Write a protein that binds this ligand. Sequence first.
Ligand SMILES: Cc1cc2nc3c(=O)[nH]c(=O)nc-3n(C[C@H](O)[C@H](O)[C@H](O)COP(=O)(O)O)c2cc1C
Ligand SMILES: Cc1cc2nc3c(=O)[nH]c(=O)nc-3n(C[C@H](O)[C@H](O)[C@H](O)COP(=O)(O)O)c2cc1C
Ligand SMILES: Cc1cc2nc3c(=O)[nH]c(=O)nc-3n(C[C@H](O)[C@H](O)[C@H](O)COP(=O)(O)O)c2cc1C
Ligand SMILES: Cc1cc2nc3c(=O)[nH]c(=O)nc-3n(C[C@H](O)[C@H](O)[C@H](O)COP(=O)(O)O)c2cc1C
Lengths: 359, 359, 359, 359
Amino acid sequence: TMINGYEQSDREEKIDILNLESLEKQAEEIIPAGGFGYIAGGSEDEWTLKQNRMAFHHRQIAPKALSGIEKPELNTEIFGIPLNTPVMMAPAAAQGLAHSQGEKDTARGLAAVGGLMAQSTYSSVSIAETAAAGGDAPQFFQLYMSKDWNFNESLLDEAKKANVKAIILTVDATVDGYREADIKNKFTFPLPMANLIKFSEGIYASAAQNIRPEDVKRIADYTNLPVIVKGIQTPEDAIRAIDAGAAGIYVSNHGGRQLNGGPASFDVLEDIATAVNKQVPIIFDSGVRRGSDVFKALASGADLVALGRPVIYGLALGGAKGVQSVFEHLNHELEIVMQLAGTKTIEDVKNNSLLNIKY
Amino acid sequence: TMINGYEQSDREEKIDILNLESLEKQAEEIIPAGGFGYIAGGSEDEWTLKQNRMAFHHRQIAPKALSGIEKPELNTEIFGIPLNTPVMMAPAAAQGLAHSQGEKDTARGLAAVGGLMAQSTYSSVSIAETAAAGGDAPQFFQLYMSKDWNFNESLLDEAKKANVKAIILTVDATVDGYREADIKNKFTFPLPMANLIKFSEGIYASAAQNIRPEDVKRIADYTNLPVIVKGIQTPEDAIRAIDAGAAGIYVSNHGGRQLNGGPASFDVLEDIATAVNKQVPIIFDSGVRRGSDVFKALASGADLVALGRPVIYGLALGGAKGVQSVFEHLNHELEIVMQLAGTKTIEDVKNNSLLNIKY
Amino acid sequence: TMINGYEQSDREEKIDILNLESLEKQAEEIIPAGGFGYIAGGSEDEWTLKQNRMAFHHRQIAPKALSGIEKPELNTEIFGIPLNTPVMMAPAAAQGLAHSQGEKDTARGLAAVGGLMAQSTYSSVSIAETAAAGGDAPQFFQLYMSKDWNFNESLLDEAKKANVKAIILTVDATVDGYREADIKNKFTFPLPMANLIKFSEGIYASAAQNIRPEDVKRIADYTNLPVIVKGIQTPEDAIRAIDAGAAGIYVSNHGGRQLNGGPASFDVLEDIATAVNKQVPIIFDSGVRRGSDVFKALASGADLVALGRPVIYGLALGGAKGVQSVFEHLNHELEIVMQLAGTKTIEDVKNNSLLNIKY
Amino acid sequence: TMINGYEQSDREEKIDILNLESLEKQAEEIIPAGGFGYIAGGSEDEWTLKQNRMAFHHRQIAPKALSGIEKPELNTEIFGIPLNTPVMMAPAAAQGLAHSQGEKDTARGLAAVGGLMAQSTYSSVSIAETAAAGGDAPQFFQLYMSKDWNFNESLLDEAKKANVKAIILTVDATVDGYREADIKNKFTFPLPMANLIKFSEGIYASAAQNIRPEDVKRIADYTNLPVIVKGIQTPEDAIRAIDAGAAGIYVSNHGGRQLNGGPASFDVLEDIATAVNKQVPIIFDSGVRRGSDVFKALASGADLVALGRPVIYGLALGGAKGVQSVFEHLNHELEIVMQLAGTKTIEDVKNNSLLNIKY
Ligand SMILES: Cc1cc2nc3c(=O)[nH]c(=O)nc-3n(C[C@H](O)[C@H](O)[C@H](O)COP(=O)(O)O)c2cc1C
Ligand SMILES: Cc1cc2nc3c(=O)[nH]c(=O)nc-3n(C[C@H](O)[C@H](O)[C@H](O)COP(=O)(O)O)c2cc1C
Ligand SMILES: Cc1cc2nc3c(=O)[nH]c(=O)nc-3n(C[C@H](O)[C@H](O)[C@H](O)COP(=O)(O)O)c2cc1C
Ligand SMILES: Cc1cc2nc3c(=O)[nH]c(=O)nc-3n(C[C@H](O)[C@H](O)[C@H](O)COP(=O)(O)O)c2cc1C
């Protein structure tokens, strides 16, 4: 399939996954060079991108002897919504760069593993189509605010009509990071932005760079849904968001694509969780690839753990069944760790105390 | 020699050893690719495998000036049993992957250097044959528990009949780690499991994933032998094992094959030893390759130091005499360190205070 | 253009800059080998050169959520002089090695972005020509003291006549560092030193190796301009300079060209700033290449941030417009960071608290 | 020149030295493979060899602003003996491996720069010839003790007759380290041991492995010379040596050739110096190659700084004039650092306070 001379994947098949990191070298044979650069890249020298991986080495999981547990269970809840896994899809623009079906194959994959999907404002496919593809699989919607509230109120209405269970407000992207891969490729989006086209019938730069605490109160009061602030990297900011009416905190550095020279996401998670003190659920992302990565995030104060790039690569390699493969593989790796660590349930993982030796 | 199309080594000869690490590149020319992958591999990205080596850099041995010692002695005891060396063979499944004689050549090698051998439940050769090959060389037996106690009680009987002096209960392998090399090779064991075949006349997944402290009391009461819990990586768990009736603690992370993202074995040894406070002997393994590695383990709270992979490589390269070469080489390296450090006996090494500079 | 068989650049054009580090590999295709070695090199094994880059990893910038700022402003002042950017040109000898126009194209570049230029005593072009090229763009003059005060007083007079707004006294170069690249190239300056030729009508070794605190008082009293001591790497020395009559402190290790085995410039900045306690403005250089580098310097106690090598490379690649490109690129990168960090103005960046996690 | 089929260097010429590290790659083109391996090698995996270099990164030299010093002076004294440099020749066996003249060209080199030479028991050339070649240049003699005191007393007599000013007792080599290069090369010394041949007319294994504190008292009482214990790596051992009658402490790990897994020599220097509290002079070696290395050793508690390998390489490349070149080059690098650091004399370097940032 082509769209303005860009080759999109049409694959639909389970994929043999060695691990999630190795999906990147595999996806690069099939995703056009400019789109691939767009997905894999981070900002400046990609130091924060690299540290997002390294930082998991900063804590260690104790093997547990004589636990008396078998057959660990991945099931959990958020805002009373049941999930089969604590692993979820992070909001990710322009999945049409990977596959002709784009976000619809993502939604089907997530529905297949009973996991949570976050839709992006900057989707290749509209809110209604993506929610329709997912059936009754729970979805969140991620809003990029306009200076224009007529636009904000229209997308929130479309989201409410689609039965989304929460709004993610993304606040760490008021401007694009300096992304060298997009500059080298002279990359321009070859396909359209469904939700923007639709507003237009009744990029980062109408968006709003100026975002205040009153804007969280306002979205909460309009939607009457739980609102989650995404991009938090400090305790003070988690407190400030809860004070303004947030129902959750999404600890993220946008996969190292924004403020390069900021810390690895993992390294600020426990501090934020200590400040939040279980007042609201916490979602965590940026650098998650192995079962041990997920275990450590849950043990450090996360309730849910989101991936971005590994899923987009799986979407290119296998469409809906590709996405499914990604979540099944990470679930497998996480089950192994939970057994060896003596954590029966996801609540046991959160109560687990990590070692802090310096390597 | 062949067995279901798998080439086994028939070599029997002393081997020139530069060092134990270099045995891996040498063994790979002769062990079939899938078996080699099975032996060399660790779990996930093998970070814990790598750290098992690195962690020895975390403490340093003081050269001692004017010690007034010569001709250091490697002799020691466990449970009143005399050994010529504190270096022992860790329990290791399926030595038939390296050599037609498998565990029998291992047993002969260990008998030749007056060292202790641990037999594995998942041996290529039965308990009785392995004990027969070793003559009067002391051996331990390593049990993988079944949900079925009729099976546990049969292997413990076979072990008692073979004059084993202790039981090792291995508790860190209730499920296989995620081992990428076995997945890449599509590796299936080409040869049988002697002790299982024998039960069947009157893999990790009858075994028992649920292991409790009462199961240590039970094995001790049945066998009336000392029981050693293997896979301990925390002080709390060493205490919990002693409380349940363990006669020893085997500090091990299974050579980095299980819970990847757990600490290097060496890094938790001194803490465990401080908690144990010489109430019971301690065995230590995972990453041991040089004389200084052994010295540091003994100085940090070990009574015995076990190897796995370096011996299996030596078995492939030289059978019984190959195994012997491995233990003679490590003994040489350890004698040098003991002389330069001013430790006359193995008890002097345990009383040695290591430096803790950060490199 | 040639001068004693040395090829000089004549280019005049905007340059596409991926980033400032990548200018070095680009400049090397066009600057003759010996001149290139002179510019890129540091002293001994260049460990201090390398650490000047690494040390920026020692602190991290917090992304700020819900800042309520847009359109950050780069404007600032020193000694009441308005600048469009806190990024300035460090004093740098012999720009004729890069371009036929030398320091004149530098001056024009800096005037184009409304930034501050420091002239060097060891210029290819005289004080008067360089100041003439810059028009009304503010410039400082960097003095290398002679044992002969008749020479000092002549250059300070030439500087005063050119309307320079301050004197930089450089005290970290009483002897050349051991620079291996100059030894390998057998490098001899192929072009003359304008300000020295001019004195001679009415290298490091008349200069003065013995520099005292009375020499700062003396230059201040003669010129009646603010005097800034450059090369400070300790709090005690910043205090000693202020005590002797310095109006500013220039934290610098001369781009790792002098005392190899001394600390990275960044690593002593906050200590010096704590001791100085805003008594005088602070200029910072050595290893600055990205927006995050500049943000971190300002946040750690700098008022201005100077570059050397990246500008010289830009001068070779594009003359006046090349230099301009360098400052526009670093300004862009700095604007992005300021937006994501929630710092509206340059005073907000100085009030920003950096994270101190260990990587 | 040949000796039992081994090619020896006959060169006599000043050598162009980029730096001391680069002498190793240059010497390897001319020294036969087995001899080269003997000189360059360390023990086990050479980790301690590597750290001897790395550890100099653990402290940093402050550039000093406004010092008011010029023309730094390298002159010093030990036991009232004047030297032109604090850089000295460490005792080094078998210099005949590098050059037909062996230790005689070393002695002439050291006499040319007014530096101190240590002779080795295991010299290619006798005590009397080496002392004769050096003229009135001060020399020390390094004793390897025999179980036989008739041998000890004969070499000490030969040393006293040669006007040596002190005895070094080397105590860190009671057995050879495990040196892999000598094992790979099947290396056997192709030339004789002059001082042993001479005893025989009226390797490490008659020597004495058992060395006590009474043996220091005994050598001091017999020779009536100052006795220096070499190989000290702990404060306790420096105290124990002073208690037994040592007149100096030689902090050394034998260039990383002995106890691999022991600390870098530099890392224990300040502790030893704090314990010694200037009761006796301290000599320091193992990993010294740059001016900054020497400055840091002096600043950390050394009185003299010895080299081994860099001199042996220089002896191969240029004989007497080669050795001279090595000491002149390191003197140059040290003069530069002393000027930039504001240390006029060698006593000023010892009073210098190093920075301790972690890199
Ligand atoms: C190609 C791509 C598009 C993205 N689009 C969005 C987006 O529209 N909204 C958003 O809030 N975050 C976006 N992100 C950030 C992700 O939500 C998430 O924080 C990140 O991808 C997690 O890091 P990982 O890719 O290493 O797992 C995007 C990330 C990628 C790689
Ligand atoms: C090929 C192989 C088979 C093993 N089989 C067993 C086993 O059957 N039982 C057990 O308790 N440990 C087993 N182990 C773990 C070892 O007992 C030991 O902890 C490990 O090999 C030590 O690390 P090293 O190989 O670096 O020395 C095995 C290890 C290897 C490499
Ligand atoms: C080629 C070159 C010439 C220099 N000339 C001078 C000079 O004449 N006076 C001076 O005070 N500093 C001089 N410096 C040091 C710079 O002022 C500045 O401290 C340094 O270049 C900053 O490090 P950077 O090049 O990594 O940004 C020079 C540096 C270079 C690379
Ligand atoms: C080839 C060689 C021979 C040596 N011979 C002796 C010796 O006979 N006696 C001794 O006390 N130390 C000996 N050493 C150790 C040196 O005295 C010194 O501690 C070491 O070479 C310093 O480290 P460096 O080579 O990195 O500078 C020798 C070292 C080398 C490399």
